[PDB]
Automatic annotation (TrEMBL), chain A:
It comes from Rattus norvegicus. This is Low-density lipoprotein receptor-related protein 2. It is found in: Apical cell membrane; Cell projection, Axon; Cell projection, Dendrite; Endosome lumen. Belongs to the LDLR family.
TrEMBL record, chain B:
It comes from Rattus norvegicus (Rat). Belongs to the LDLR family. Disulfide bonds join 2-14, 9-27, 21-36. It is found in: Apical cell membrane; Cell projection, Axon; Cell projection, Dendrite; Endosome lumen. This is Low-density lipoprotein receptor-related protein 2. It comes from the Eukaryota.
């Protein structure tokens, strides 16, 4: 079925609806990491910004200075 | 060493013992949750 026709400048179609993503999924991170708290199967994993490493294998604290959030 | 009330990850990281059996694999290892007793439902079910 044809929905609609637009210019060949169209690059992507994306559905903008509440049920497109399960909004009620719980964030597993426990406010441990100093910078990034990425996800992994059944949990999370801390990481440092590019170039900075963990201090003395703390695996939560990096050599990078923390930066204020942008609103 | 880790405190009485703090569980130990075998990597040398001490974490609060509450996180054991909380349902998420908290260590860099999976041994925060490996060895947890499964939830008991009912006898004969
Ligand atoms: C969107 O995600 C939510 C979670 O944020 C889903 O709700 C939960 O889904 C799980 C997995 O299907 C269910 O187990 C949950 O039901 C209850 O879970 C507890 C264990 O935590 C059991 O003891 C209960 O008996 C019961 O089964 C369910 N509820 C919550 C909030 O945990 C939801 O299904 C999902 N919805 C969509 C549209 O994808
Ligand atoms: Ca846990």
């Amino acid at each position: 079925e044809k929905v609609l026709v637009v210019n060949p400048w169209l690059t992507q179609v994306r559905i903008f609806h509440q049920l497109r993503y399960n909004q009620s999924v719980s964030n597993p991170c426990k406010q441990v990491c100093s910078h990034l708290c990425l996800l992994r199967p059944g949990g999370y994993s801390c990481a440092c910004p590019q170039g900075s490493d963990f201090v003395t294998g703390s695996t939560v604290q990096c050599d990078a200075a923390s930066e204020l959030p942008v609103t | 060493e880790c405190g009485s009330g703090n569980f130990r990850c075998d990597n040398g990281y001490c974490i609060p013992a509450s996180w054991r059996c909380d349902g998420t694999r908290d260590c860099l290892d999976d041994t925060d949750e490996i060895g947890c007793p499964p939830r008991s439902c009912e006898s004969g079910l």
